[PDB]
Amino acid sequence: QMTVKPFLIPADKVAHVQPGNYLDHALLVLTKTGYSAIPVLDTSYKLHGLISMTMMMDAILGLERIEFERLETMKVEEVMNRNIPRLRLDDSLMKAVGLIVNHPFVCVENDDGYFAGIFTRREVLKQLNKQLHRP
Amino acid sequence: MQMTVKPFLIPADKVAHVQPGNYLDHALLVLTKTGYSAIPVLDTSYKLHGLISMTMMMDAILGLERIEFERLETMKVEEVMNRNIPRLRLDDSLMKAVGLIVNHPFVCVENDDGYFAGIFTRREVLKQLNKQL
Numbered sequence: 001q002m003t004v005k006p007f008l009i010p011a012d013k014v015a016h017v018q019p020g021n022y023l024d025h026a027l028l029v030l031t032k033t034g035y036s037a038i039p040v041l042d043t044s045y046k047l048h049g050l051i052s053m054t055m056m057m058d059a060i061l062g063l064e065r066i067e068f069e070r071l072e073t074m075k076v077e078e079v080m081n082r083n084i085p086r087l088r089l090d091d092s093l094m095k096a097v098g099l100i101v102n103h104p105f106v107c108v109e110n111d112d113g114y115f116a117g118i119f120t121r122r123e124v125l126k127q128l129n130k131q132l133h134r135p
Numbered sequence: 136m137q138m139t140v141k142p143f144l145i146p147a148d149k150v151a152h153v154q155p156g157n158y159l160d161h162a163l164l165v166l167t168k169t170g171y172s173a174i175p176v177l178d179t180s181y182k183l184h185g186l187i188s189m190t191m192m193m194d195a196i197l198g199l200e201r202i203e204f205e206r207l208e209t210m211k212v213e214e215v216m217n218r219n220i221p222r223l224r225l226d227d228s229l230m231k232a233v234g235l236i237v238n239h240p241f242v243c244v245e246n247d248d249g250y251f252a253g254i255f256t257r258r259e260v261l262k263q264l265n266k267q268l
Contacts, residue, residue: 022203031193036172036240053189057167066160068204074242094268101261102238104172121257125237128264 002093007124008108015040016115019048019077023056026076037103039115040080046108047115051080058104087119100124138229140255143263147253152177155184155213159192160225162212172240175251176216181245183251185216223255233260 016039017026030038030053037052059079060067085099087108097107100121112115151169153162155176166174166189166246178253195215205255221235234257235242241256 026195027202028197030192034205043152053193054167057163057189060166061164066163066207071202097265097268099264101258104257121240121261122237124261125233125257127171129233129237132233134229135230135231 003090004087004093004096004108004119005089005126007093007096008089008119009119009123011045011115014039016119017051017076018042019080020075023074023076023079026051027053027056027071037081038109039118040076041115045114046079046088047109049080049082050084050107051076055079055081089116095122096125138231139225140223140227140232140244141225143255143259144225144231145253145259147181147184147251147258150175150254153212154178154214155189155211157212159207159210159212159215161173162187163189163192164237175243175254176212176250177251181250183222183245184213184244185218186220187216191215193218225252236260 015029017035019040019042028040037050040048040051041068042048056071056079057066059074060070085103085106086095087106089100089108089110096106096119100119105118105120108116108119151165151171153165153179162174173186176184176187178184192207192215193202195210195241196206221239221242222240223232223235225244225246232242236255236257241254244252244255246252
């Protein structure tokens with residue numbers, strides 16, 4: 001029974017944003033990263049949730065218009081999703097795969113309680129390919 | 136031994152899409168309703184032209200002095216959609232398909248007629264693998 005610790009991409013290699021940053025900032029980072037959502041970490045590096053562009057747009061959709069002016073005054077904490085799956089550096093690999101069937105990727109918190117990195121579909125699929133052999 | 140795309144396929148009618156003629160603010164609106172990274176761009180003939188994503192839209196309007204949001208109500212989807220995307224066919228190997236979705240959350244599939252017929256996705260391959268276990 002393998003565990004998460006082996007496929008995990010360390011936090012230092014993952015972009016994130018602070019819960020007090022303005023949406024327009026998170027928007028900028030998301031545009032330049034290659035992920036669907038981005039972890040929201042406070043100053044202590046404690047994971048607070050994920051935020052994606054759909055989350056932002058969905059919160060500024062007015063009846064008459066997409067109120068873009070708000071991205072400059074709203075902080076990420078008001079839009080981010082807090083109810084997210086979280087894996088421990090030492091959870092069953094079995095458990096992790098189940099979760100990435102539904103989520104493009106899942107956040108991994110170290111044993112103390114700090115964001116340690118992320119478990120992705122690419123890294124899992126990457127291995128799978130080899131156990132067969134590529135195009 | 137060598138399975139094939141077909142079985143995993145996700146019919147096109149269960150997949151949201153947009154036309155090269157649509158305005159970005161419209162594509163923007165559609166992506167916000169769907170749990171997909173990007174959406175296929177079909178002409179009315181129903182023939183794949185490329186993919187559009189929120190990231191592609193935001194990037195085409197990132198300016199020096201600001202993010203020019205107003206241009207989303209002006210530019211058509213064809214001004215930013217990636218016309219250079221991988222494509223499949225109902226008869227391509229499953230090994231070729233898996234290699235492609237390692238780098239792509241999902242890949243477009245055109246039936247032998249050259250019409251969009253659905254999408255090959257990571258979730259569906261991972262769903263299968265999760266059982267195989």
